[PDB]
Amino acid sequence: MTPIDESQLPVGPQVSVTDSAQHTGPFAASSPLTITVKPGAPCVRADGYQESMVTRVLDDKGHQVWTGTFDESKLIGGTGLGTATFHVGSPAAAFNFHGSERTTYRTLSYCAYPHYVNGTRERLSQVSVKTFMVDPALNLEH
């Protein structure tokens, strides 16, 4: 019942969101984006078996716009050392990006059980944050 320390938990899963063009921000409002998070740390359950990779995004107001989960268990002998990619898609669709100016988003990810908890929370591995900006008028075409 104490506050876990960074030295008590393993490393956190890297966060990197890029489009099909594998470019950086600002991104195009009419352009789909993909969130690619790397392991780096041995993520597993109590028994030592992979659980899942959580990845959600928060708007500028601090409201979660996106959310996803990957089944690390699928990785054979991975031990929580596999890359996790999610087809988020366009920012206006996935990140209900309803703005006419350069906005600043924030993505996060962690190896926490996908199941629901009574009230308290738990962190099996560190957490990484990745901020990205989007442009409402950058590129319309593909």
Indicate the domain borders of the chain.
14-135
Nearest 5°: the CA angle 25, 29, 31 is 80
| Core vs surface per residue 7-45: b (16+ CB within 10 A) or e | eebbebbbbbbbbeeeeebbbbbbbbbebbbbbbbbbbe
Token pair in block for residue 43: 């993520």
**Residues near 49 by beta carbon (within 8 Å), at least 6 away in sequence:** 73
Say which experimental method was used. Answer: NMR
d(C-alpha 114, C-alpha 65), whole Å: 18
CATH 2.60.40.1930 given to domain 14-135: yes
